[PDB]
């Protein structure tokens, strides 16, 4: 009956204190907290053989578990650090046999602390119009999405045709591009597809909008610097069909 | 270690672990975030299936093998190998690196061709757009820093029945001309 963990995204300065939630209706005994890096490989940091049991994991990090109820595992982080920046994933198991073991896991939270907030960078979004040599010699139209510059990591682009989201024709790349590979805090950039039928996109009265979700500064978090606060924000861009 | 292959073709994942066990498991990573249970293979098991699913296991030189067969875009995923040993009490389940397999269609009716798109708000920026080529070709990284390109993307067009791949490339420079990035 699923394992939810929240929130999704984090992005916060050191010296901030951080509690990631866990939760499960499944009613299993045992909870796990593994750590992910972006080098690729899973780390045991905490686990719970149930209420009252915590335990120190494979790698040691400076962070603290809570199990009051057999369904919440929250992990508490007292003090955040750049060396905190990672992928923090929630898992369950039972204890009867029949397909037996084999973990459940949540779909985790990435964070990303910074040390310096000037960093921090919320995307421009553009649209580009299909090509009308595509659509003369293909009969279909191609919408191309772009969003550049930001930073951290952490978007999530969509598609809006005539105010629905749409699934159908679309691409997105798997992951950002670094804007200067070399750069330790380097901005990223991020591309999307979106394909149509020609009189689709040569119907004057459709509307088309690209949508990218940022992850970013908190209401509060302190900001002295003159652009505006890069708070977790939606930048759009649209474009109407050409009557052609 | 990545593996891309082409959709109904096979895929043999394998795997080395240190101290031994008494319980191998494989699982998949989705989108780089959340992980599922695939198979399951005892201590005293050589081979198990689960459908498409096929493992095999020996304790004599500490390795393991997962055989996906007649593949789907769907399995493309990150496959993870997971050992299990205990003292009875505990149940230490560790996690390997990790294998990147991206699984693509085949393409009906290639038709390779790059054009340039421009933008809808009054600006002279532009992207190119390499599409519709089949899926036995290379998308070359740019050996120019001011260049950017992306990796390859496959669109699903359902209701035509038709699929087709694409890459962009844009870059920051005055007067770019689509007609060579990308060129291999």
């Known amino acids: 009956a699923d394992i939810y963990q929240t929130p999704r995204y984090l992005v916060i300065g050191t010296g901030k204190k951080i509690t990631l939630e866990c939760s499960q209706t499944?009613?299993?005994?045992?909870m796990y907290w593994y750590q992910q890096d972006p080098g690729m490989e899973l780390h045991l940091i905490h686990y719970?053989?149930?209420?009252?049991?915590?335990e120190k994991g494979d790698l040691s990090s400076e962070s603290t578990v809570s199990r009051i109820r057999t369904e919440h595992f929250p992990l508490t982080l007292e003090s955040a650090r750049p060396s905190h920046t990672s992928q923090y994933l929630c898992?369950?198991?039972?204890?009867?046999?029949?397909?037996?073991?084999?973990?459940?896991f949540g779909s985790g939270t990435r964070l990303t602390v910074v040390e310096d907030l000037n960093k921090v960078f919320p995307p421009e979004v553009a649209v580009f119009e299909p090509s009308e040599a595509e659509i003369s010699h293909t009969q279909k139209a191609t919408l191309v999405c772009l969003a550049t510059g930001f930073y951290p990591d952490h978007v999530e682009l969509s598609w809006w045709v005539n105010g629905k989201e749409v699934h159908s024709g679309v691409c997105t790349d798997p992951q950002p591009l670094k804007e200067q590979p070399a750069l330790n805090d380097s901005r990223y950039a991020l591309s999307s597809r979106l394909r149509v039928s020609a009189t689709f996109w040569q119907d004057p009265r459709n509307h088309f909008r690209c949508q990218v979700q940022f992850y970013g500064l908190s209401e509060n978090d302190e900001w002295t610097q003159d652009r505006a606060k890069p708070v977790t924000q939606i930048v759009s861009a649209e474009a109407w069909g050409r009557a052609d | 270690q990545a593996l891309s292959i082409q959709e109904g073709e096979n895929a043999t994942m394998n795997c080395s672990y240190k101290?031994?066990?008494?319980?191998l498991q494989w699982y998949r990573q989705n989108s780089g975030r959340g992980l599922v249970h695939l198979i399951l293979?005892?201590?005293?098991?050589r081979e198990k299936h689960s459908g498409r699913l096929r493992v095999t296991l020996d304790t004599s030189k500490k390795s393991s093998s997962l055989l996906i067969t007649a593949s789907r875009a769907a399995d493309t995923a990150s496959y993870f190998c997971?050992?299990?040993?205990?003292?009875?009490?505990?149940?230490?389940?560790?996690f390997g690196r990790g294998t990147q397999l991206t699984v693509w269609p085949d393409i009906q009716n290639p038709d390779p061709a790059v054009y340039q798109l421009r933008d809808s708000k009054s600006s002279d920026k532009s992207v190119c757009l390499f599409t519709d080529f089949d899926s036995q070709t290379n998308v070359s990284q740019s050996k120019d820093s001011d260049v950017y390109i992306t990796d390859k993307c496959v669109l699903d067009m359902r209701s035509m029945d038709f699929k087709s791949n694409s890459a962009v490339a844009w870059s920051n420079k005055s007067d770019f001309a689509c007609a060579n990035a990308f060129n291999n």
């Open positions: 898992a369950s198991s039972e204890s009867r046999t029949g397909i037996n073991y084999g973990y459940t």
């Open positions: 499944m009613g299993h005994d045992k």
């Open positions: 719970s053989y149930g209420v009252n049991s915590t």
């Open positions: 101290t031994s066990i008494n319980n």
């Open positions: 293979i005892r201590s005293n098991e």
């Open positions: 997971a050992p299990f040993d205990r003292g009875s009490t505990l149940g230490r389940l560790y």
